[PDB]
Write a protein that binds this ligand. Structure first.
Ligand SMILES: COc1cc(-c2cncc(-c3ccc(C4CCN(C)CC4)cc3)c2C)cc(OC)c1OC
Ligand SMILES: COc1cc(-c2cncc(-c3ccc(C4CCN(C)CC4)cc3)c2C)cc(OC)c1OC
Ligand SMILES: COc1cc(-c2cncc(-c3ccc(C4CCN(C)CC4)cc3)c2C)cc(OC)c1OC
Length: 284
């Protein structure tokens, strides 16, 4: 049997410290090709080890196609191949679009569904998984209006560190119980609540919308330091602003309440992904 392995790389859609992401062609179909830097090889090994353990298949998790290691003259090339979402990341999408009630709820419920699927242990099945780097750049927008969660390079299974802007207080003040798997679920719930805030800002009510901003845009610099974030989140205990205009809208009022219950200083007081899913389904 012939095995057609050739991928044509067509355009670069992402470049960073991690490496690059390319739109590629395989047998007439779009694929996304993440090429890792040597600096970030451990992210390729973690994501590969996870998918070798459990082949995740969920509509709100970026679809795995392949992990490839190729031998080069004086180096190894590490590639992760996934489904391609031509609408790009939620971060990208929120900059140039506003949302209505239905599209805002569809986005956040799809993210909650993906996250609950990661978090749940299923017997027979999958281990429980914490993402550890949830943010709007690690969420992709699909044509059907739902999103999917990407990048399991920092993920931890039960049975590089997170982006500083989205770190929970217990990460910033180094009190997180590192031995306790539920601590990592609670870290993801904090980051989820910041994503919920980013999205809700872009939902129109009464002819009003907020400009896209990243969480804590008004209180920390670009590329905030660990110390910058610790002072805001742990010492001053600041939380993202809820604008007055949200309290005229039943959807945004319910989402504000949800956000608050993701941001408790005490990690054990935070809602579970499954409770967020239920709350979101009952809105509107
Ligand atoms: C090695 O590398 C890559 C390969 C492929 C690829 C292309 N055609 C066919 C296949 C294939 C799948 C499954 C079987 C078998 C399974 C069990 N058996 C009992 C019956 C049938 C055979 C062949 C593959 C795996 C795609 C890749 O990327 C998109 C690869 O990596 C770049
Ligand atoms: C990596 O991804 C893709 C792979 C393929 C692909 C290519 N050749 C053969 C296969 C295949 C055939 C048969 C089995 C099974 C059937 C039942 N039992 C006997 C066990 C073995 C498995 C695999 C596949 C899945 C196509 C894709 O898309 C069109 C892929 O995605 C881009
Ligand atoms: C976050 O993480 C990963 C993401 C992806 C991924 C999958 N589909 C589509 C994309 C994408 C496409 C296009 C744009 C822009 C560029 C062109 N124009 C300016 C508007 C649209 C942005 C994003 C990506 C980046 C793949 C990954 O791995 C192979 C990722 O890593 C796990």
């Amino acid at each position: 049997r012939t095995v057609a392995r050739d991928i044509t790389l067509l355009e670069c859609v992402g470049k960073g410290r991690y490496g690059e992401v390319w739109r590629g062609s395989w047998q007439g179909e779009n694929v996304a090709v993440k090429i890792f830097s040597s600096r970030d090889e451990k992210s390729w090994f973690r994501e590969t080890e996870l998918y070798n353990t459990v082949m995740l298949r969920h509509e709100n998790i970026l679809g795995f196609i392949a992990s490839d290691m190729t031998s080069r003259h004086s180096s190894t090339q590490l590639w992760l191949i996934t489904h391609y979402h031509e609408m790009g990341s939620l971060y990208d999408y929120l900059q140039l679009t506003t949302l209505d009630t239905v599209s805002c709820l569809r986005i956040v419920l799809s993210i909650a569904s993906g996250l609950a699927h990661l978090h749940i242990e299923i017997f027979g099945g999958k281990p429980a998984i914490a993402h550890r780097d949830l943010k709007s750049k690690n969420i992709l927008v699909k044509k059907n209006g739902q999103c999917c969660i990407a990048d399991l390079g920092l993920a931890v299974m039960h049975s590089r560190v997170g982006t500083k802007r989205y770190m929970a207080p217990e990460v910033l003040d180094e009190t997180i119980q590192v031995d306790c798997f539920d601590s990592y679920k609670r870290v993801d719930i904090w980051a989820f609540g910041l994503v919920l805030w980013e999205v809700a800002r872009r939902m129109v009510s009464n002819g009003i919308v907020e400009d896209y901003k990243p969480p804590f845009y008004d209180v920390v610099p670009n590329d905030p330091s660990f110390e910058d974030m610790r002072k805001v989140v742990c010492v001053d205990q600041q939380r993202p602003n809820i604008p007055n205009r949200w309290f005229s809208d039943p959807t945004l009022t319910s989402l504000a309440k949800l956000m608050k219950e993701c941001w408790y200083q005490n990690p054990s007081a935070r809602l579970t992904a499954l409770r967020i899913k239920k709350t979101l389904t009952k809105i509107d």
